[PDB]
Structure 1
Amino acid sequence: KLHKEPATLIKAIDGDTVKLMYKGQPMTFRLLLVDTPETKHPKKGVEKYGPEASAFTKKMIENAKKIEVEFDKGQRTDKYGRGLAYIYADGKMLNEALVRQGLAKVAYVYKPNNTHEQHLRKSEAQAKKEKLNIWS
């Protein structure tokens, strides 16, 4: 069973990457199961809705009372040393919020890090249907 643990903001980096203090150490987190358009894309640089996604994450995270991280059941870091987590701002999952607003797609999923996959697919379906942002 997953559980939430506390963390503190250091810096929002991008739509899908944030640096947090977690168990007393600065650590970079990559949001599980979502892909946002990027402003720091390694090959492309700045994509459409990149700035919008980055602004949404920034605002949501900087204005929260409480930030929690929730690891999935599998590997907890990727090959770049980033924590792979669901991030909650005042009990709302940022990963879901991005997908719901049409500012992220559901990623390619790597089992067993896929606990909230169905929930996120449902939000993406709704965003598509409403033609929000990426889907417009």
Structure 2
Amino acid sequence: LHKEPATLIKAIDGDTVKLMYKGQPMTFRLLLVDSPETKHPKKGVEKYGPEASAFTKKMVENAKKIEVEFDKGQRTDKYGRGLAYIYADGKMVNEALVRQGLAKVAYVYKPNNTHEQHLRKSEAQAKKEKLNIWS
């Protein structure tokens, strides 16, 4: 797997960010994580949704460098969003959310599952620490 440079355009949700990638504006969905949502009427503004959302936004907004890391599987989902691990100054946003109990680890579709074990490890610690979601 390799990291590629990208530029923040806009944070949209806890698990969704708009980036400039290879000169094109593109919406990325964060791989392997399920964040409470501020969007979708088939929920709405769920609990911790605004919290997960502010965490992703500060994290990408305050970074000097953002990088995208595609996994081994498909790189787009059916809605046209890129499927990636997103890094803010070397720190994986996907892992940070889960470590803070602000996301669960998603149902996982091989072969897009390289960092699966790492995140499950962070998710067990957040639950052990009874953080946010896990409170």
Q: How big is each residue's C-alpha offset from its partner over 1:33-92, in whole Å with a ceiling of 9 and x where there is no partner?
A: 000000002411100000000000000000000000000001000000000000000000
Q: Secondary structure at the match of 1:78?
A: coil
Identity of aligned residues (%): 98
Runs of 4+ deviating beyond 3 Å: none
Q: How big is each residue's C-alpha offset from its partner over 1:90-130, in whole Å with a ceiling of 9 and x where there is no partner?
A: 00000000000000000000000000000000000000000
Q: Secondary structure at the match of 1:95?
A: helix
- For 1:111 and 1:37, the matched residues in 2 are separated by 23
Q: Which runs of 5+ in 2 are unaligned?
A: none
- For 2:54 and 2:40, the matched residues in 1 are separated by 16
Instruction: Report the more deviating stretch, 124-133 or 34-43.
Output: 34-43
Q: Secondary structure at the match of 1:87?
A: strand
Q: How big is each residue's C-alpha offset from its partner over 1:18-41, in whole Å with a ceiling of 9 and x where there is no partner?
A: 000000000000000000000002
Q: TM-score normalised to the size of structure 1?
A: 0.98
- For 1:26 and 1:65, the matched residues in 2 are separated by 19
- For 1:85 and 1:42, the matched residues in 2 are separated by 25
Q: Secondary structure at the match of 1:39?
A: coil
Q: Which runs of 5+ in 1 are unaligned?
A: none
- For 1:101 and 1:76, the matched residues in 2 are separated by 26
- For 1:56 and 1:41, the matched residues in 2 are separated by 19
Give the equivalent residue in structure 2 for 1:48: 47
Once superposed, what is the RMSD of the aligned Cα atoms?
A: 0.5
- For 2:38 and 2:99, the matched residues in 1 are separated by 20
- For 1:67 and 1:84, the matched residues in 2 are separated by 15
Instruction: Report the more deviating stretch, 38-47 or 68-77.
Output: 38-47
* Aligned length, in residue pairs: 135
- For 1:78 and 1:89, the matched residues in 2 are separated by 22
Q: Secondary structure at the match of 1:122?
A: helix
For the pair 1:14 / 2:22, whether they are aligned, the reply is: no
- For 1:102 and 1:125, the matched residues in 2 are separated by 9
Give the equivalent residue in structure 2 for 1:60: 59
- For 1:41 and 1:50, the matched residues in 2 are separated by 11
Give the equivalent residue in structure 2 for 1:110: 109
